[PDB]
Design a protein around this nucleic acid. Structure first.
Ligand SMILES: [Mg+2]
Ligand SMILES: [Mg+2]
Ligand SMILES: [Mg+2]
Ligand SMILES: [Mg+2]
Ligand SMILES: [Mg+2]
Ligand SMILES: [Mg+2]
Ligand SMILES: [Mg+2]
Ligand SMILES: [Mg+2]
Ligand SMILES: [Mg+2]
Ligand SMILES: [Mg+2]
Ligand SMILES: [Mg+2]
Ligand SMILES: [Mg+2]
Ligand SMILES: [Mg+2]
Lengths: 76, 137, 45, 95, 95, 234, 243
RNA sequence: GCUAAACCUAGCCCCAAACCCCACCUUACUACCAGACAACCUUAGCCAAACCAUUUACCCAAAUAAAGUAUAGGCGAUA
RNA sequence: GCUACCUAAGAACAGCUAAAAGAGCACACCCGUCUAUGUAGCAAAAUAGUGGGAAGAUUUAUAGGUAGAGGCGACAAACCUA
RNA sequence: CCUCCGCAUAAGCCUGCGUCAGAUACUGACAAUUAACAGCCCAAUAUCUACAAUCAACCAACAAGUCAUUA
RNA sequence: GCCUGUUUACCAAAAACAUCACCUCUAGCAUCACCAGUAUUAGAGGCACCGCCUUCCUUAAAUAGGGAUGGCUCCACGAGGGUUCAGCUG
RNA sequence: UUAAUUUAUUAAUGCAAACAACCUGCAUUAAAAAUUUCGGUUGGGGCG
């Protein structure tokens, strides 16, 4: 029995537009419009990086990348 | 599908409880072979014309017997005056004979203890009823 | 006994008849459009 | 009937009248006798002969039929071999 | 495919005009459902030996299911187009 | 409606979880089940129904210590906090489960039948025929779903091949692979039947709303040959 | 008052005004032209005239198409011009009985199709009519390239058409790279459908998509007036020096 | 003689012609944080048929005429 | 935003008798048995007295939810902005 | 002589008996409510959290409950 | 009518509705209600706690009132419908 | 409601379709409903 009901789990992203499956053509998305419209393909935005260090919007590295991380598990 | 439709006829169209249907299947396996429509007619014959309620229909293996025998004996008694269909209130002038006394007993015992008539008259009535059924169909 | 069916509360007022809720559905958008066409000074509540 | 149609504004014709009555251009309306095809086995020869006849209509009936039909049905028709060509006009009629 | 037909005939529209439909023209009756038609066969030209059908370059009438599910998807057969027929004809006459 | 299920927690824990009542309403806000609403506020204790759940980086049969047996507001049966290795979990306590007792959870189907001690979990194949069981799975590793109410106990009626026939408390036969695990003995709180609600207020505390005041009166439709005898006048 | 133009000509006027005017001529013609789709849900009359049995006279006959509803799911698949028939029926097929709403839906299958030009396999929700059309066309590529927009009636189908046409127009080496002979064979097989890339780029684009494409094409950050004035002054000085 | 009464233009109707700084979707008019939900889907009924149940005219791409004709229709109201 | 029910998280319940009570008497509070006034009224259902409950199936503030071929209902066909 | 009340907070309202000058708590103008009270919050990733409240101690329980952190 | 409670907001508060208790029917089961539940459970409904077996009297006059599986059974309670002692009183 | 007409809708099955299930088409059976009506005389009521 898994904990966390599907309806509460994060919704799956909508399926990609079929236009993206055609090798030779560049899809026409609403990225240029800088806003969503329902009759254009949904852009695939590249991952974004803030570019600097903002303390109030900090995203710590994964636990495995911390300097003090150790395979041996201490018990505190 | 045959088994399921038999069970569905017994439950939805005959309003037998689940336990009642299981007991009916246990006691009268021939119901499964019996075709639909005929089974419903037999049950409604017991229910309306004979005024037998589901607990009695199940307790006495009424569905075991054949519709021909059931109609023969029951209509013979009804025309003789021994049997009487219950009224709207479910009451009868004279208590009706028991289903075991009608169907389970042999022909001679049924004619002597309950009908109190002659085998010759019973044969004549059986032929007449068969002719009437043929004409009706 | 009757008459005071209105028990004012700005939270309920805005959440029930506000601009955001009217735009939240196509029917509310058409409500706002009807008010604009009629020339209502107050489009929403 | 429809005095002004919704598409042309014209007066319409009750086609039930056209399917049943003949108009002679003189203004008379001819018809069959009701029941002339019904249960002939129980009707006497004289009654059958009466029923098999083509019959004129009343003045009021003719007026009603004229109202119910438009002018197109009240024109001169020079059909090739019309059996009613002679009957289309009146002769030796005083008032 | 479901093929339907109007219960009520649509009045002629004209040459350049479009027919004007009404509520009664939306009433349909099913004349035929193509899926219930008897199955036909697909003509294919085999490219590789396949059990119980043929060897290579021979026209074969195969059940549409087999043609569209195994032969064509796996390349064991090609459509019996005029071009393919010609090419396999040259193959045969060269062999 | 803006209804989101409170069953959103993803990681198992021992803490009672604040649970939101439904009132018999769907996520759409409409009543779907009647007679539900109100009652005492409750906190949910996540029960681990997969009693053979060997700890991380561990395997094989393991023992556990019954830390305590507690009343569960969300169940008829009472629960038991039980600890093994370096973890604690809630389970459904059996009739004679006591604090400080030892519990065994094994996946070993021994050639001989294992001595059935109440409270431990063995695969159904390892139990002697006729032993009382509960917290039975439908499939291997699915998790206990049957025989979970207070005082209920199924019977391991038969074992043939890899299939065991169990008698559910409703006296219905059920076929389950003998590798599926079940716990021995009858569920706790056996006297739940005899509890007397005493007053309508106690039901309202339990969260059951009163039945509808409407008076509810199907019927066998007579066949044409029988329509003449339906309502014979007196 | 009265509008200067009929309301039904407003779309055409909008096309003749604005960025839609700047759209390429061939695309505008493709949008404007409309052809009746091939009959799918009705059997067309064989001839234009028919001798009606009632009065035995010759009468003109017309093929009035059945309105078809195409749910958006269709645009993600390849239905052979097939769609939902939202109509009405007479219970027991007699006009003197009740009239009931009736929706006839097509039987949809999930099938995998390989595109030779695109060298890709697509899983598409498809109809038996579409499969029959593909068989008649001798392949998915031929079916897509032959069937016009109206008959194809699928946004995914038109996108496949655009991709195939662009591939053919560019003679893209990305088709089976390292196999030039196979690439040339495929292009020769589908040669007849090749069209100029400038036209293939706009095949199957909706009006909104074409507008967005035109805007992206013609969007340019304004040139600083410093450059323009420097060029103008330098040219003027050149003229002054020469004359 | 009080209440009053009187007014003429504010405008409107029908056609023709002609195509038409800042803030604001959060509680709108709110300077400034991790998105994702996005749209399309037979009008119905009143009413007429003297009830009503099949049926009952409606931005259609040139006025007129063919013509209320051919046709449709509980072959009836009507179309 | 009334009202029917529900969800989240709150709040109120003097005093006496009893003892851990859907207990008794009785404030606040909720209700509305009977009488009188009033009846274009203070009031489109009120006032005075009298009365039922008043630690519970209680009352109640806040926000949210269920919407009409529906909702909600300890069925009165009650309530869903007089 | 009355006191059911009253003073504050909440909610609601929005200048609605403060001054001046005029009409007959109205009009026009002028002024005014100053934050400590209250609202307006929280950097991530995992990980933590069984033991009510009731003077919380006896005692009694049932309807089984509002109060927490670590690396 | 078991009881406490609920109801026709604005003419009916009741014997009506609910109600513990009992009875009937349906269901062998997971990730949005039932339910993060599992037949001692859940839903639908009936009925109503529990418990059992199978001519005279009142007045002087009293169409008022009381006594000689269901069915019976009034302990307690009631602004319920009747009757009544004594007292009290315009 | 055992008034008339329907199954549009759900639930089942059957036959097709397609490769057991799902989906679609066509049937059958139920549940649920939907539209519409409830002639005339005989003081009312019952039976007539
Ligand atoms: Mg309120
Ligand atoms: Mg013309
Ligand atoms: Mg009418
Ligand atoms: Mg107190
Ligand atoms: Mg009390
Ligand atoms: Mg009632
Ligand atoms: Mg009533
Ligand atoms: Mg009572
Ligand atoms: Mg009471
Ligand atoms: Mg209530
Ligand atoms: Mg009232
Ligand atoms: Mg009252
Ligand atoms: Mg008296």
């Amino acid at each position: 029995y898994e904990w966390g009901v599907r309806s509460t789990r994060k919704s799956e992203p909508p399926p990609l537009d079929r236009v993206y499956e055609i090798p030779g053509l560049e899809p026409i998305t609403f990225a240029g419009k800088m806003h969503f419209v329902p009759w254009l393909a949904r852009p695939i935005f590249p991952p974004w990086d803030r570019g600097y260090k903002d303390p109030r919007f900090y995203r710590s590295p994964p636990l495995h990348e911390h300097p003090l991380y150790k395979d041996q598990a201490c018990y505190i | 599908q045959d088994i399921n439709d038999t069970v569905r006829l017994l439950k939805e169209k005959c309003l037998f409880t689940v336990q009642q249907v299981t007991k009916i299947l246990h006691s009268c396996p021939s119901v499964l072979r019996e075709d639909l429509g005929q089974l419903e007619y037999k049950f409604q014959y017991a229910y309306f014309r004979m005024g037998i309620k589901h607990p009695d229909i199940v307790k006495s293996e009424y569905l075991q017997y054949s519709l021909t025998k059931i109609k023969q004996r029951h209509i013979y008694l009804e025309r003789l005056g021994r049997y009487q269909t219950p009224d709207k209130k479910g009451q009868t002038q004279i208590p009706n004979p028991l289903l075991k006394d009608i169907l389970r007993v042999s022909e001679a015992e049924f004619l002597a203890r309950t009908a109190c008539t002659s085998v010759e008259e019973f044969q004549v009535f059986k032929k007449l009823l068969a002719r009437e059924e043929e004409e009706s169909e | 006994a009757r008459g005071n069916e209105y028990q004012p509360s700005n939270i309920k007022r805005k959440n029930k008849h506000g601009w955001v809720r009217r735009l939240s559905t196509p029917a509310g958008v058409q409500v706002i459009l009807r008010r604009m066409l009629k020339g209502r000074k107050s489009l929403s509540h | 009937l429809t005095y002004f149609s919704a598409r042309k504004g014209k007066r319409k014709t009750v086609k039930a009248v056209i399917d049943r009555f003949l108009r002679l251009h003189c203004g008379l309306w001819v018809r069959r006798k009701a029941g002339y095809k019904k249960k002939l086995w129980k009707k006497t020869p004289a009654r059958k002969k009466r029923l098999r006849e083509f019959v004129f209509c009343n003045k009021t009936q003719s007026k009603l039929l004229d109202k119910m039909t438009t002018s197109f049905w009240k024109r001169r028709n020079w059909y090739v071999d019309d059996p009613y060509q002679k009957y289309h006009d009146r002769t030796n009629l005083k008032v | 495919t479901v093929i339907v037909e109007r219960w009520w005939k649509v009045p002629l529209a004209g040459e350049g005009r479009k027919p004007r439909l009404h509520r009664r023209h939306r009433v349909y009756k099913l004349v035929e459902d193509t899926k219930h038609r008897p199955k036909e066969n697909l003509e294919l030209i085999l490219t590789q030996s396949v059990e119980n059908v043929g060897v290579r370059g021979d026209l074969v009438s195969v059940k549409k299911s087999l043609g569209r599910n195994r032969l064509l998807p796996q390349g064991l057969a090609v459509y019996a187009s005029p071009e393919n027929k010609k090419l396999f004809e040259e193959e045969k006459l060269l062999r | 409606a803006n209804f989101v299920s409170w069953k959103s927690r993803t990681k198992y824990t021992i803490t009672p979880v604040k649970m939101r009542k439904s009132g018999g309403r769907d996520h759409t806000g409409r009543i779907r089940v009647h007679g539900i609403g109100g009652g005492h506020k409750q906190r949910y204790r996540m029960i681990d129904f997969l009693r053979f759940r060997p700890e991380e980086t561990k395997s094989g049969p393991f023992e556990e210590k019954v830390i305590q047996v507690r009343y569960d507001p969300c169940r008829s049966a009472d629960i038991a906090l039980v600890a093994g290795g370096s973890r604690k979990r809630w389970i459904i306590a059996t009739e004679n489960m006591q604090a400080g007792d030892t519990i065994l959870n094994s996946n070993h189907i021994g050639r001989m039948a294992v001595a059935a001690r109440e409270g431990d979990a063995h695969p159904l194949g390892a139990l002697p025929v006729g032993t009382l069981i509960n917290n039975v799975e439908s499939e291997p590793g699915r998790g206990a779903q049957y025989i979970r109410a207070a005082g209920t106990c199924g019977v391991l009626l038969r074992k043939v091949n890899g299939t065991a026939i169990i008698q559910l408390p409703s006296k219905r036969q059920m076929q389950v692979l003998e590798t599926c695990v079940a716990t021995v003995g009858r569920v706790s709180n056996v006297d739940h039947n005899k509890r007397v609600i005493g007053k309508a207020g106690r039901n309202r505390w339990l969260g059951k709303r009163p039945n509808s005041g409407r008076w509810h009166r199907r019927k066998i439709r007579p066949l044409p040959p029988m329509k003449s005898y339906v309502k014979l006048p007196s | 008052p009265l509008h200067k133009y009929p309301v039904w000509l407003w779309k055409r006027l909008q096309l003749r005004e604005g960025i839609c005017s700047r759209l390429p001529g061939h695309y505008l013609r493709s949008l404007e032209e409309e052809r009746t789709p091939t009959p799918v849900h009705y059997r067309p009359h064989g001839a234009k005239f028919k001798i009606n049995p009632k009065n035995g006279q010759r009468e003109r006959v017309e093929d009035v198409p059945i309105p078809i509803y195409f749910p958006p799911e269709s645009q993600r698949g390849l239905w052979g011009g097939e769609g939902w028939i939202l109509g009405q029926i007479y219970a027991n097929n007699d006009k003197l009985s009740k009239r009931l709403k009736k929706v006839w839906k097509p039987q949809l299958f999930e099938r995998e199709f390989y595109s030779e030009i695109l060298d890709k396999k697509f899983t598409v929700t498809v109809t038996m009519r579409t499969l029959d059309l593909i068989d008649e066309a001798y392949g998915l590529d031929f079916y897509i390239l032959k069937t016009p927009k109206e008959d194809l009636c699928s946004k995914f189908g038109m996108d496949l058409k655009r991709g195939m046409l662009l591939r053919l127009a560019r003679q893209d080496p990305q088709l089976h790279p390292e196999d030039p002979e196979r690439r040339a064979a495929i292009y020769d097989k589908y040669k007849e459908f090749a069209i100029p890339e400038e036209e293939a780029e706009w095949v199957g684009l909706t009006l909104e998509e074409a507008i967005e494409k035109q805007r992206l094409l013609e969007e340019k950050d304004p040139v600083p007036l410093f450059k323009i004035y420097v060029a103008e002054l330098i040219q003027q000085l050149q003229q002054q020096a020469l004359s």
